[PDB]
Amino acid sequence: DIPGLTDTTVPRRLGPKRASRIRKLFNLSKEDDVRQYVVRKPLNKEGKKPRTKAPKIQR
Amino acid sequence: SGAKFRISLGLPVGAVINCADNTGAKNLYIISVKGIKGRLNRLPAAGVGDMVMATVKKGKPELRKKVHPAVVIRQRKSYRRKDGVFLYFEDNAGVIVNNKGEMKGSAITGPVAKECADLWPRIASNAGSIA
Amino acid sequence: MKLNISFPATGCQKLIEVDDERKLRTFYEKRMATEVAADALGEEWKGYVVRISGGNDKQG
Amino acid sequence: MKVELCSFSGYKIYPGHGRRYARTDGKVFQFLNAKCESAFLSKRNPRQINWTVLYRRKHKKGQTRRAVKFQRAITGASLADIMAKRNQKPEVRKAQREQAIRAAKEAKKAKQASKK
RNA sequence: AACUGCGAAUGGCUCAUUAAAUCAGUUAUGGUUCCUUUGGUCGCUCGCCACUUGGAUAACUGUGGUAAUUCUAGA
RNA sequence: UGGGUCGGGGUUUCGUACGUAGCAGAGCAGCUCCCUCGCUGCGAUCUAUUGAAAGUCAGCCCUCGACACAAGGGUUUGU
RNA sequence: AAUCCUGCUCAGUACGAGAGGAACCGCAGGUUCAGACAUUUGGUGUAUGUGCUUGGCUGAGGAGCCAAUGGGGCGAAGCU
Ligand SMILES: [K+]
Ligand SMILES: [K+]
Numbered sequence: 198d199i200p201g202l203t204d205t206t207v208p209r210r211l212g213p214k215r216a217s218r219i220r221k222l223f224n225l226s227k228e229d230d231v232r233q234y235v236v237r238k239p240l241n242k243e244g245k246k247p248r249t250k251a252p253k254i255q256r
Numbered sequence: 257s258g259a260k261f262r263i264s265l266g267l268p269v270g271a272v273i274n275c276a277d278n279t280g281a282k283n284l285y286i287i288s289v290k291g292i293k294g295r296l297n298r299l300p301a302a303g304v305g306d307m308v309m310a311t312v313k314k315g316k317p318e319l320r321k322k323v324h325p326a327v328v329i330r331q332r333k334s335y336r337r338k339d340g341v342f343l344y345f346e347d348n349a350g351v352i353v354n355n356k357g358e359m360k361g362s363a364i365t366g367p368v369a370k371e372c373a374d375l376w377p378r379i380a381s382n383a384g385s386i387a
Numbered sequence: 388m389k390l391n392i393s394f395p396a397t398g399c400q401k402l403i404e405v406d407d408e409r410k411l412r413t414f415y416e417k418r419m420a421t422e423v424a425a426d427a428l429g430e431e432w433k434g435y436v437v438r439i440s441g442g443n444d445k446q447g
Numbered sequence: 448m449k450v451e452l453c454s455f456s457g458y459k460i461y462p463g464h465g466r467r468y469a470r471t472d473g474k475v476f477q478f479l480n481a482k483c484e485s486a487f488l489s490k491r492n493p494r495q496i497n498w499t500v501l502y503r504r505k506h507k508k509g510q511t512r513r514a515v516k517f518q519r520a521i522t523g524a525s526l527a528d529i530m531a532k533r534n535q536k537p538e539v540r541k542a543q544r545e546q547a548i549r550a551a552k553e554a555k556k557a558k559q560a561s562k563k
Numbered sequence: 564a565a566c567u568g569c570g571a572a573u574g575g576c577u578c579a580u581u582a583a584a585u586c587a588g589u590u591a592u593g594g595u596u597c598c599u600u601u602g603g604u605c606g607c608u609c610g611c612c613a614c615u616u617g618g619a620u621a622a623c624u625g626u627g628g629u630a631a632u633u634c635u636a637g638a
Numbered sequence: 639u640g641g642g643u644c645g646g647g648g649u650u651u652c653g654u655a656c657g658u659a660g661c662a663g664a665g666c667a668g669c670u671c672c673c674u675c676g677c678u679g680c681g682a683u684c685u686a687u688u689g690a691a692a693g694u695c696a697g698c699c700c701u702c703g704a705c706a707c708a709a710g711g712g713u714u715u716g717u
Numbered sequence: 718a719a720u721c722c723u724g725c726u727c728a729g730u731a732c733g734a735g736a737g738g739a740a741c742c743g744c745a746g747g748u749u750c751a752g753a754c755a756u757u758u759g760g761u762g763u764a765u766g767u768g769c770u771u772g773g774c775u776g777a778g779g780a781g782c783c784a785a786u787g788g789g790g791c792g793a794a795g796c797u
């Protein structure tokens with residue numbers, strides 16, 4: 198590993214949105230609770246209560 | 257400091273060179289070269305960076321029938337530049353200056369030889385490009 | 388001369404500053420989108436083939 | 448060991464050889480010898496002169512499929528989380544689809560009382 | 564914020580050019596184009612996704628270059 | 639051993655030889671049981687063979703390949 | 718058998734009210750002359766070297782030749 202380069206992998210900022218791009222990523226077949234499988238991003242600010250934020254899924 | 261090295265002259269007295277400044281003169285007819293002691297039957301000749309006395313043959317009437325100091329900025333004779341390169345230009349060109357060394361015009365059309373630049377800082381500042 | 392290195396698998400791109408021509412000259416005379424091995428730099432850049440993706444001129 | 452130049456013919460001009468030509472329009476050219484210089488002055492195109500480097504590469508005289516995609520962590524789920532979710536495949540997924548239907552079926556029975 | 568759609572061809576200024584040219588009245592497009600508005604038309608066709616298919620790209624995070632620009636590159 | 643003469647290599651000059659081939663070629667002329675889109679000619683030029691061909695010490699450089707030739711001739715010279 | 722000049726520095730210094738304004742040493746170059754030289758650049762070029770080309774000629778091709786150096790481009794060496 199290169200020091201400071203091949204380590205501390207950065208995550209993709211935010212997951213798939215289209216109702217098919219989540220199925221390919223998670224091997225959804227059909228109507229397997231598609232809504233819940235979408236990635237829910239958590240938000241953590243000091244001057245506020247913790248809360249997670251889900252996106253609107255298209256198609 | 258550093259003085260100018262000898263270069264091939266190639267512009268004898270009687271040569272009509274183009275005037276590269278915006279003074280309104282179109283050509284310059286070299287009548288003599290400054291600093292020439294000379295020799296029997298030898299024509300005083302000038303190269304780039306040489307100060308010459310010239311009369312404009314065609315141009316504007318207020319410049320015509322007079323003797324103007326001029327400095328050769330481009331020459332068509334090839335000359336060696338101490339580093340092995342033989343350089344020559346597409347035409348013989350000069351600019352009209354005063355005895356002090358300041359160009360009467362304000363802009364120069366075309367390149368200016370490097371020898372003429374560092375020898376005449378006033379001409380160098382007005383030069384669009386340096387060859 | 389600076390080198391922008393990015394590894395898509397882990398992100399975390401970082402800038403490398405080099406003043407040695409020989410480490411750079413493996414890259415020299417190469418076009419874009421050509422994969423070159425960076426075995427020139429030290430003993431840590433080994434087993435690494437890298438693709439030229441772009442750059443900038445002295446004037447930017 | 449000066450700057451190494453190239454001619455009208457693409458050849459490599461060592462110091463002390465050839466001439467350099469500065470045109471009035473500001474462009475500067477260097478030629479290896481009078482042959483290359485005279486050809487340039489007569490406006491001959493080097494792509495049509497056989498012994499020129501430009502001609503040789505123009506006529507080329509003498510001289511797969513790949514793709515990869517990698518799983519990554521996505522903010523809100525580590526690579527472990529997505530793998531576990533997509534590893535619910537062996538009927539665990541089917542187990543989750545069917546409980547949602549009955550979890551919406553009794554709501555539909557309540558919705559029938561709410562619709563009508 | 565950004566992608567998208569629309570507008571930016573209106574308005575305003577000036578009168579240099581221009582003497583059957585411009586322009587005015589009259590007439591034609593049975594010799595053409597036309598965003599928009601309004602009204603028609605949108606099952607008229609026999610011919611392993613349709614309970615919804617594919618890929619990228621913005622904005623965004625991150626690394627910069629350039630003296631400079633409403634400049635931009637790579638990831 | 640020698641120096642020659644050829645040959646070879648190097649260098650260099652010019653610029654890509656003849657022949658052959660091409661569904662290259664402005665086009666044109668003949669054959670149509672033929673062909674179902676073709677064949678047989680003419681045609682400057684183009685492309686490949688081909689940085690090819692040609693010259694290069696006669697006052698260019700190196701050969702150790704080949705061939706013959708080289709202890710031969712004449713005139714003089716003494717304290 | 719060498720010759721003379723310019724620029725930089727000395728130095729906006731000495732000197733002078735001011736305006737103006739040197740010199741010695743040192744450095745970098747030039748003029749005229751002299752003696753060579755051809756690595757480079759230029760000139761020559763009948764290597765009659767290699768392409769191109771007009772008229773004619775060898776039955777055509779190929780290969781050439783004649784036109785007092787046919788003309789022209791490029792050109793080794795040598796001279797310069
Ligand atoms: K004189
Ligand atoms: K041939």
Ligand SMILES: [K+]
Nearest residue numbers: 497654688690
């Ligand atoms: K060829």
Ligand SMILES: [K+]
Nearest residue numbers: 765767789790
């Ligand atoms: K000739």
Ligand SMILES: [K+]
Nearest residue numbers: 481760761792
């Ligand atoms: K010559």
Ligand SMILES: [K+]
Nearest residue numbers: 761793794795
């Ligand atoms: K010569």
Ligand SMILES: [Mg+2]
Nearest residue numbers: 253254255256
């Ligand atoms: Mg939608």
Ligand SMILES: [Mg+2]
Nearest residue numbers: 295296297298
């Ligand atoms: Mg006389």
Ligand SMILES: [Mg+2]
Nearest residue numbers: 645646647694
């Ligand atoms: Mg030989």
Ligand SMILES: [Mg+2]
Nearest residue numbers: 718719720750
């Ligand atoms: Mg004397």
Ligand SMILES: [Mg+2]
Nearest residue numbers: 770771772773
């Ligand atoms: Mg003939």
Ligand SMILES: [Mg+2]
Nearest residue numbers: 777778779780
């Ligand atoms: Mg013939």
Ligand SMILES: [Mg+2]
Nearest residue numbers: 774782783784
């Ligand atoms: Mg005869």
Ligand SMILES: [Mg+2]
Nearest residue numbers: 783784785787
């Ligand atoms: Mg005769």
Ligand SMILES: [Mg+2]
Nearest residue numbers: 481762791792
């Ligand atoms: Mg010649």
